[PDB]
Design a protein around this ligand. Structure first.
Ligand SMILES: Nc1nc2c(ncn2[C@@H]2O[C@H](COP(=O)(O)OP(=O)(O)OP(=O)(O)O)[C@@H](O)[C@H]2O)c(=O)[nH]1
Ligand SMILES: Nc1nc2c(ncn2[C@@H]2O[C@H](COP(=O)(O)OP(=O)(O)OP(=O)(O)O)[C@@H](O)[C@H]2O)c(=O)[nH]1
Ligand SMILES: Nc1ncnc2c1ncn2[C@@H]1O[C@H](COP(=O)(O)OP(=O)(O)CP(=O)(O)O)[C@@H](O)[C@H]1O
Ligand SMILES: Nc1nc(NCc2ccc3c(c2)OCO3)cc(-c2cccc3[nH]ccc23)n1
Ligand SMILES: [Ca+2]
Ligand SMILES: [Mg+2]
Ligand SMILES: [Mg+2]
Lengths: 309, 440, 420
């Protein structure tokens, strides 16, 4: 038997991972304070990394990368982009942003305020791509898994989180048409179920309306961005040759403008998943991240590129 | 006697030729008009410098050399430049249209139209020799002419002069100054076709020379002129034993015996020291020990590789200038007690040493300091196979897609020549692996 | 050594004339053909494009062709119109009325032999002809159909010489003439087989540049042609001035064309400074002369040309930086696929400039656009009688459509290929 412990009660993803492992027959769950575990499903806050890897005869694995918070906070992300030469202040795919301690339309964030007067201040994208019918804004969520060997796996199913309100240049106080979060929307549901559109439909739409595909017009840029971000921090967080090992699931959020240019908005370090895909994605984590280290008795695209120059 | 004939092929070969002959003129006191006032035997002689220069009755000292290119602009610069009077016009041979970076045009389509004239001019030089020793051939791997025409020429020379020795000086490609995507194709094609026709080949990696010029001469962006002047210093170190006399001088052919254990294993690694600027040479006299030490620093090698992760099969030291054996022996003893020098078990570990007393020379207005003493090491090490690996990988990436191959097929080549050459390179890498294993 | 230049039809002749004006100015050649420059660098490779006549007169090695007479008059009255050889003007009377079949099979066939006589006389006296460049549009009748006829006949007589075109692709934003997608598909069908190199100069992109970036509310032909002439000057700079590099058209082609059919290039120009700014701008979609996003595909090969006095160290560092930060857009199986040239002599009115030449699979977006308009008419057979009345079959239209769809599919195949 392999042995594991669960320490974050609110993870949907890992509640399903846990139930799958148990139903394998070959994993036993332990109480949260037993140190004799192979695998820790850790808490989000102050996970005790300094206590891992000191148990003779147990290979120990955890589902978080220490240091990844640098990518997953707004101020840290702005600082990492501006100060890292592989990204640079002139990075073309991230909006102009400025750290502030306590077409000139800006957004302030970390309750959100968008104005052209007046935390991070970020350039607000005034010319978004608008879906027809409804003349409406959206954002793209992608899920990405990084294994103990630092392979980068892009889950093949994404999701568009849409607005169901027409976009209004002349009202930035009213946030229902400008902010595409799932909670804030629940005209919810009119066009699609739960304001969620999946890749098959969106690809069909891009073919019929704009005579192109999702792969060519959008996905190349997404893959470029994800790979560039994670290759930037690899030296700081890799656990190769370390006494314990890590994997982690990340959530990348993107904006698409009216010329089919992709912009990074946010990296989320503890994402949830769209309902319909829990079953498949969680099974993929078990296959790729856990059994690879602890073998028992593809839905991902591996991102790798070694250009010579 | 014992004369040597030099052949300079394509742009890189020609321009390196210019640097070498200028330096030889300075070392021997020959003026640009060909006069040599110190030579009191008019119209002939068997002095050591006569291995490389013949003499006319009018006192002119004439290089034993042919320059060949398929277009005229580089050799036209020789025809109009400073040393235009050194060479007889029949020694400078040009066509009208080049090989456009394509091995197939240099070996077949264009090369076939000029090969007989080149061979006849070479024959004219050979007939003036009373005991011809062999040939020195200068060329790039990457150009269409330097690759393909050189291949053709080597094949014809084996026919016309039998087993007569042939040595190469070969320019290995680097991306920092490279100009063609297809250079890996040309490099494998010529290496395959020449392998049986060459007795010994000295490879010079443009990336190593570029690095050394930047790091040691403080040149921000080195030109071909900088690189060729340094290359010429290494060539001069190698041929100095043929061109000067002396009691501690050691013949290069005698080194070849030691450098080549099997016919295919004939690619020595060269290392030269000191390369230093005038501003840094001031008040800093470099001893025999300092330069001998610098010969085991990988940053001074002519080819990028790591001898610390291979095995030695031979190791030779060629000193010139103010150098006596006692200091050589003390330096060698120290190096043996301090460094990672592992020989194969079928070969003795003694270092072979030569000393020539004539001091090093530099060209006026150059970036090199004049120094009192210098050294060139020649080692036969398995680590040099790393350079083949790098080239083979680039070859594979393109060939799997057949990228650019249509340019070669359109001039009459077949794909079978690509795969036959690539297999021969695979077997060479395997040979270099086999020679480093221990006996049983 | 020598290049022979040909210009066919209205568009071809207008941009040809602008090209000759700009380069004559760069070499210090006045309208009479006399040299009055200040620097020996102007004449050292002058013979590439100019003949020497008696009196040290320099005469363009240029042939001027149209089925419509009067463009000859407008050229002859243009500022440099006296510089051209009078016997090199070959013009008919009829016109082609925007009908490719007239250019390729009927009116143009009658005149092509007289065009070839002038070509042959110019070629016979070249020390070592490297090849030919043709300027034309693909949307009219004369340049498209008769120009591709000329290409085929030249290949018959000079099969071992290089054939290069600068080909202006149609857009509804500049011409409303409804049959243009037929003429462009029929010409492209020829070009895939018989040229070594084609610069796609797209009137869509030129219009959008003049309108958005240069702020010209009603762009004229003069504004489009200013951009075209600056691009063409840029791309012939490396052959025209003495300078580190020893090349001919064949070696350039050998460096740029990995597969014989995929020889359609995307040009760019910047600015419309510092080396980082030039470098960033030349790789921006908004600076391309073909309406394509290079981030929707991958680069097979790229050439970058910088003009003006600047640090070569800095140019090298910036080219490496762009490759490192944009690595996903370059195919991994062609190592060292980006080439750089620097010319000391700037263009007129600028201290620093950059010209871009890209072989990108994103060019499929251009071919897709044209293809859509083609199908919209062919499915209703609209205006087809214009062509069948000249002897053509429907079958030739079917084949041309099929070949352009194949070209698209091939670009997609090499975009998706990997190394492992
Ligand atoms: N070290 C050194 N390398 C050179 C020199 N000139 C050219 N090269 C290198 O040689 C390769 C190009 O080959 P070339 O000698 O220019 O070509 P070629 O023999 O004239 O062949 P074609 O011009 O194609 O007919 C590139 O890798 C250059 O970096 C030179 O003067 N010195
Ligand atoms: N960029 C640019 N495009 C032009 C210019 N002149 C004409 N065009 C384009 O050329 C296309 C029409 O082809 P033409 O050159 O007029 O046809 P032609 O070769 O003269 O043949 P005919 O007029 O039928 O005898 C249209 O789509 C125009 O937009 C020009 O000066 N600059
Ligand atoms: N610079 C900008 N331009 C245009 N829209 C922007 C923007 N910044 C934010 N938005 C919009 O605001 C929405 C919410 O912003 P934010 O990035 O804070 O989401 P979030 O972090 O609350 C969701 P999660 O945490 O689950 O990833 C985005 O979905 C986007 O539609
Ligand atoms: N293919 C290609 N490339 C060009 N310049 C890019 C480049 C520069 C330096 C390079 C290189 C490529 O490869 C190695 O060094 C120009 C052209 C051209 C076309 C048509 C007419 C022309 N008249 C003069 C030129 C030219 N054609
Ligand atoms: Ca003598
Ligand atoms: Mg050459
Ligand atoms: Mg007309």
């Amino acid at each position: 038997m392999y042995t594991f412990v669960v320490r974050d009660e609110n993870s949907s993803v890992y509640a399903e991972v846990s139930r799958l492992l148990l139903a394998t027959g070959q994993w036993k769950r332990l109480r949260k304070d037993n140190p004799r575990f192979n695998l820790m499903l850790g808490e989000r806050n102050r996970l005790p990394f300094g206590r891992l890897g000191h148990e003779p005869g147990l290979v120990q694995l955890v589902n978080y990368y220490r240091g990844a918070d640098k990518l997953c906070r707004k101020a840290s992300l702005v600082k990492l982009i501006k100060t890292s030469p592989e990204l640079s202040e002139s990075c073309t795919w991230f909006p102009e942003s400025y750290v502030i301690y306590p077409g000139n339309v800006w957004i302030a964030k970390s309750g959100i305020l968008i104005s052209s007067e007046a935390h991070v201040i970020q350039k607000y994208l005034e010319k978004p791509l608008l879906l027809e019918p409804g003349h409406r804004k959206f954002d793209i969520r992608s899920w990405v898994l990084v294994d103990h060997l630092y392979n980068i796996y892009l889950y093949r199913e994404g999701v568009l989180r849409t607005s169901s309100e027409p976009y209004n240049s002349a009202n930035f106080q009213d946030k229902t048409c400008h902010l595409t979060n799932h909670c804030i929307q629940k005209n919810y549901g009119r066009y699609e179920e739960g304001n969620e559109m999946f890749f098959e439909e969106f690809n069909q739409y891009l073919m019929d309306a704009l005579n192109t595909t999702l792969e060519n017009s959008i996905l190349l840029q997404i893959k470029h961005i994800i790979r560039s971000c994670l290759m930037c921090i690899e030296p700081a967080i890799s656990t190769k040759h370390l006494h314990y090992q890590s994997f982690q699931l990340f959530g990348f959020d993107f904006m698409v403008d009216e010329e089919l240019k992709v912009w990074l908005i946010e990296v989320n370090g503890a994402p949830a998943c769209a309902q319909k895909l829990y079953a498949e994605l969680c099974q993929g984590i078990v296959d790729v991240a856990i059994s690879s280290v602890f073998p028992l008795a593809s839905i991902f695209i591996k991102l790798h590129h070694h250009h010579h120059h | 006697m014992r004369e040597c004939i030099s052949i300079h092929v394509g742009q890189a070969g020609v321009q390196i030729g210019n640097a070498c002959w200028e330096l030889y003129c300075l070392e021997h006191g020959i003026q640009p008009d060909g006069q040599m006032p110190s030579d009191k035997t008019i119209g002939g002689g068997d002095d050591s410098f006569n291995t490389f220069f013949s003499e006319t009755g009018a006192g002119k000292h004439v290089p034993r050399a042919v320059f060949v290119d398929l277009e005229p602009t580089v050799i036209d610069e020789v025809r109009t430049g400073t040393y235009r009077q050194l060479f007889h016009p029949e020694q400078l041979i040009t066509g009208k249209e080049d090989a456009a970076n394509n091995y197939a045009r240099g070996h077949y389509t264009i090369g076939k139209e000029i090969i007989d004239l080149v061979l006849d001019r070479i024959r004219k030089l050979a007939d003036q020799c009373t005991g011809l020793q062999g040939f020195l051939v200068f060329h790039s791997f990457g150009g269409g002419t330097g690759s393909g025409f050189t291949s053709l020429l080597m094949e014809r020379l084996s026919v016309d002069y039998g087993k007569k020795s042939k040595l190469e000086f070969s320019i290995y490609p680097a991306p920092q100054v490279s100009t063609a995507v297809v250079e890996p194709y040309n490099s494998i094609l010529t290496t395959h076709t020449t392998l049986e026709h060459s007795d010994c080949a000295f490879m010079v990696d443009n990336e190593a020379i570029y690095d050394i010029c930047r790091r040691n001469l403080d040149i921000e962006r080195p030109t071909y002129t900088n690189l060729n002047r340094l290359i010429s210093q290494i060539v001069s170190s190698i041929t100095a034993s043929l061109r000067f006399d002396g009691a501690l001088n050691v013949d290069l052919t005698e080194f070849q015996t030691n450098l080549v254990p099997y016919p295919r294993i004939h690619f020595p690694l060269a290392t030269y020291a000191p390369v230093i600027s005038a501003e840094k040479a001031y008040h800093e006299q470099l001893s025999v020990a300092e330069i001998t030490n610098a010969c085991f620093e990988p940053a001074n090698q002519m080819v990028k590789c790591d001898p610390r992760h291979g095995k030695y099969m031979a190791c030779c030291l060629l000193y010139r200038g103010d150098v006596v054996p006692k200091d050589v022996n003390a330096a060698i003893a120290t190096i043996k007690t301090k460094r990672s020098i592992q020989f194969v078990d079928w070969c003795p570990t003694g270092f072979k040493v030569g000393i020539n007393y004539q001091p090093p020379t530099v060209v006026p207005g150059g970036d090199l300091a004049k120094v009192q003493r210098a050294v060139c090491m020649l080692s036969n090490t398995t680590a040099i196979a790393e350079a083949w690996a790098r080239l083979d990988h680039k070859f594979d990436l393109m060939y799997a897609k057949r990228a650019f191959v249509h340019w070669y097929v359109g001039e009459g080549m077949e794909e079978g020549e690509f795969s036959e050459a690539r297999e021969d390179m695979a077997a060479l890498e395997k040979d270099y692996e086999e020679v480093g294993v221990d006996s049983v | 050594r020598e290049i022979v230049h040909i210009q066919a039809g209205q568009c071809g002749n207008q941009i040809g004339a602008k090209f000759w004006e700009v380069i004559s100015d760069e070499h210090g050649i006045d309208p009479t053909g006399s040299y009055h420059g200040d620097s020996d660098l102007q004449l050292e490779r002058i013979n590439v494009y100019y003949n020497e006549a008696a009196g040290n007169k320099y005469v363009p090695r240029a042939i001027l062709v149209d089925l419509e007479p009067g463009t000859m008059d407008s050229v002859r009255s243009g500022p440099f119109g006296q510089i051209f050889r009078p016997d090199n003007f070959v013009f008919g009377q009829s016109g082609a009325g925007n009908n490719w079949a007239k250019g390729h099979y009927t009116e143009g066939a009658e005149l092509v032999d007289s065009v070839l006589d002038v070509v042959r006389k110019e070629s016979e006296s070249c020390d070592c002809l490297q090849g030919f460049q043709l300027t034309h549009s693909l949307g009219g009748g004369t340049g498209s159909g008769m120009g591709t006829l000329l290409i085929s006949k030249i290949r018959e007589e000079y099969p071992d010489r290089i054939m290069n075109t600068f080909s202006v692709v149609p857009s509804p934003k500049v011409s409303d003439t409804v049959v243009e997608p037929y003429n462009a598909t029929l010409s492209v069908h020829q070009l895939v087989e018989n040229t070594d190199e084609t610069y796609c100069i797209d009137n869509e992109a030129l219009y959008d540049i003049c309108f958005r970036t240069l702020k010209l509310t009603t762009p004229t032909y003069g504004d489009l042609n200013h951009l075209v002439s600056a691009t063409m000057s840029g791309v012939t700079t490396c052959l025209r001035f003495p300078g580190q590099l020893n090349a001919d058209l064949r070696k350039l082609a050998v460096n740029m064309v990995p597969f014989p059919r995929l020889h359609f290039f995307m040009p760019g120009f910047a600015p419309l400074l510092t080396v980082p700014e030039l470098t960033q701008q030349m790789f921006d979609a908004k600076n391309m002369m073909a309406a394509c996003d290079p981030r929707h595909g991958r680069y097979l090969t790229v050439a970058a040309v910088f003009r003006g006095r600047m640090s070569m160290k800095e140019v090298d560092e910036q080219m490496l930086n762009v490759q490192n930060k944009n690595s996903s857009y370059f195919v991994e199986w062609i190592p060292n696929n980006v080439k750089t040239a620097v010319c000391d002599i700037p263009p007129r009115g600028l201290k620093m400039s950059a010209t871009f030449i890209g072989n990108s699979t994103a060019i499929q977006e251009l071919f897709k656009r044209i293809s859509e308009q083609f199908t919209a008419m062919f499915r209703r057979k609209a205006f087809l009688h214009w062509y069948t009345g000249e002897g053509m079959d429907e079958m030739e239209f079917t084949e041309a459509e099929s070949n352009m769809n194949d070209l698209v599919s091939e670009y997609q195949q090499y975009q998706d290929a990997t190394a492992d």
